[PDB]
Design a protein around this ligand. Sequence first.
Ligand SMILES: Cc1cc(Nc2cc(-c3cnn(CCN(C)C)c3)nc(Nc3ccc(CC(=O)Nc4cccc(F)c4)cc3)n2)[nH]n1
Ligand SMILES: Cc1cc(Nc2cc(-c3cnn(CCN(C)C)c3)nc(Nc3ccc(CC(=O)Nc4cccc(F)c4)cc3)n2)[nH]n1
Lengths: 289, 289
Amino acid sequence: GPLSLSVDAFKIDPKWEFPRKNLVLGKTLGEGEFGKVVKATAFHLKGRAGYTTVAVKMLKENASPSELRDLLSEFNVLKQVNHPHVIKLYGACSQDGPLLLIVEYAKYGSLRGFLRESRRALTMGDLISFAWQISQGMQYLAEMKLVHRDLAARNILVAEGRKMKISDFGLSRDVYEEDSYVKRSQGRIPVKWMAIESLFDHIYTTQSDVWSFGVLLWEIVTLGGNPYPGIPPERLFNLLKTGHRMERPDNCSEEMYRLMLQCWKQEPDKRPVFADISKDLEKMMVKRR
Amino acid sequence: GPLSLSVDAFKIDPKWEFPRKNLVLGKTLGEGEFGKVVKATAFHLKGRAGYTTVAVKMLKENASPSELRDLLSEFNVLKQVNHPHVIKLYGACSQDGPLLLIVEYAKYGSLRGFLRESRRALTMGDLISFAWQISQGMQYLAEMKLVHRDLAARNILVAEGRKMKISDFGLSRDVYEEDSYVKRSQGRIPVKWMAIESLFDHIYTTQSDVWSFGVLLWEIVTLGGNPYPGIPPERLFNLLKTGHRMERPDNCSEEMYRLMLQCWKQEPDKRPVFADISKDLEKMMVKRR
Ligand SMILES: Cc1cc(Nc2cc(-c3cnn(CCN(C)C)c3)nc(Nc3ccc(CC(=O)Nc4cccc(F)c4)cc3)n2)[nH]n1
Ligand SMILES: Cc1cc(Nc2cc(-c3cnn(CCN(C)C)c3)nc(Nc3ccc(CC(=O)Nc4cccc(F)c4)cc3)n2)[nH]n1
């Protein structure tokens, strides 16, 4: 079937193969979508003499076919994209042991954990700078005809210099032909981040990510808050279609909240595009000086 | 879409509704397939005066549509089956809070944890008695035209008197019409427990469960061992089709190992049925006396 053909295709791309003897695994940083993330160090990686610190994405115990397929999908997307605000890929280990992906290591970890451990001194301007970088990256992925589908604070990484990096591409899909990706079965993205049409019609486009980007903005202004607090995920069906959205979060400007509301418009065509979301954030920072 | 129609259908079955004020949640026993399992106590449950200890299956934080659909599926199967070796359902809480399923509590927990914490004095006969009960239960589910699809040691519960209970019905499906369930997308069952045709053709029948029952027998004789030890799950594709199986585990009889091999025959029709798997286990115990 489909997965057995992909796996065999892998065992056959030398520019990405890395010897296993030069890889040393370390502590478990956390549990990913299709497995576990591990801190490691690589010797003579990509012509970089000496050891280099890196992160390894691998399958955990009792991996299912969907998790294996998701690991192969992320490897196929990362080796195509290149942008300062998207996690960089270095290689993979496919022979003489389990399947490993070698990616960039981010000092400060995920954006959610970085924010929940702050009040760290962070101003409103730095919060706007973070969102701007994320829009610069999503603007680049959309131009490559890709839908992330799982855009949230936990899927963003914070590297040296507080530079955002979009990560976790396991659920990403290509949409060059139809401009949309449709899933017949039930998806595996958290409900509270999904667009209304994605939740009801299983349609995923570049405008569905705009919805998720509005929830991500809500997470940032609330410094790692949980969306729709105190609402069972099974109730969002009747709440969203009736026209209800999250209320004004404290420590938020009327312009920031208005930008969120526009990302949550029922009609996808009425929602803004990433190119315009950047201009809005851009002017929100030049005025507060 | 499909899930939004099921959820609305739920909010409309009084014989299973239980008031929330009579439910008191406790410690987290563990993390389930679609969420978390919690130890609780229910007041005046099913005409049983006083408090009764129970287990609650609920959605965890950031639940996805697939996890919600799986919670609704288990609720639909459990309210149809009734057998001494299948977990019993008591009710559910659907109004005035999150979605909860109230099921039977098993003193000793899962069969895997029960075995890994033993050497507890367990003989070969008691190991045969455990497998026999599990076959009695699967024989009853097959007669109801149901495929469990996720039969393993962690999905079995051990109750008072060391009586087995088949649990975790989230991935179970009905097969009354076609006698088989086919999944177009990639499944979510651990590879090392899947039948070869399930892994390649995405076909699930009552004979696919026999394959999984043979791996479960391997877990029991090895007292909670991990199948195919030291083999990446992505390699099972080429290993299974080439005709390789797990080797003779120590502390195992030639008849017990031969029963396993028959559950692993490539041709599903050549594999035995549960009615015959019981007779084999039955005579394996009357002779060792
Ligand atoms: C892949 C990668 C990781 C990194 N770097 C780091 C650094 C740190 C870190 C924390 N503290 N300190 C040092 C501070 N100390 C001293 C207090 C460093 N932590 C992490 N954890 C970590 C971050 C992201 C994920 C992926 C993920 O969540 N997937 C997922 C999960 C669930 C659902 C879903 F949809 C997707 C996994 C784990 N990662 N770079 N590249
Ligand atoms: C639902 C239910 C639970 C129970 N009773 C108990 C009792 C105990 C227990 C342990 N020790 N002691 C007392 C001994 N002390 C003193 C040392 C009691 N533990 C558990 N844990 C527990 C058992 C099963 C699951 C479901 C599951 O794993 N789903 C899953 C997960 C991953 C993948 C997948 F495909 C499926 C979750 C958690 N459950 N009855 N009914």
